[PDB]
Design a protein around this ligand. Sequence first.
Ligand SMILES: Nc1nc2c(ncn2[C@H]2C[C@H](O)[C@@H](COP(=O)(O)O)O2)c(=O)[nH]1
Length: 124
Amino acid sequence: KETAAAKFERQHMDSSTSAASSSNYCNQMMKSRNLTKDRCKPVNTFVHESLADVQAVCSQKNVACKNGQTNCYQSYSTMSITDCRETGSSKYPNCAYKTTQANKHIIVACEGNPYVPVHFDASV
Ligand SMILES: Nc1nc2c(ncn2[C@H]2C[C@H](O)[C@@H](COP(=O)(O)O)O2)c(=O)[nH]1
């Protein structure tokens, strides 16, 4: 099946853009990444950084996860991120999102060999 590490890249990585360009960003990216296929995923963050800069977070500030796990890491640097959150007009299969572009530090959980991000925890 897809790896936890490949699922994080499909859900979270957008190295192909620097920032969301239009209020449509989340609607197009949630659908094309397959995030709306069984239900509307309600919150999802996109990171507009190279894959190497985000895998590097796994060697940065170790912090507790929101759930208490201690395999979380916070980026030293802020990153370009897009927060996509479902709107009150959102109704399955026509999921709809509000797009918010920001520069925030990211908190990811890491696992494995090589030790890479497998979960997006929070932007701060
Ligand atoms: N699982 C997951 N949680 C996310 C993602 N992006 C943001 N969140 C989290 C971080 C915040 O704890 C929370 C949302 O509500 P708020 O309290 O209003 O910002 O959801 C994501 O991509 N995946």
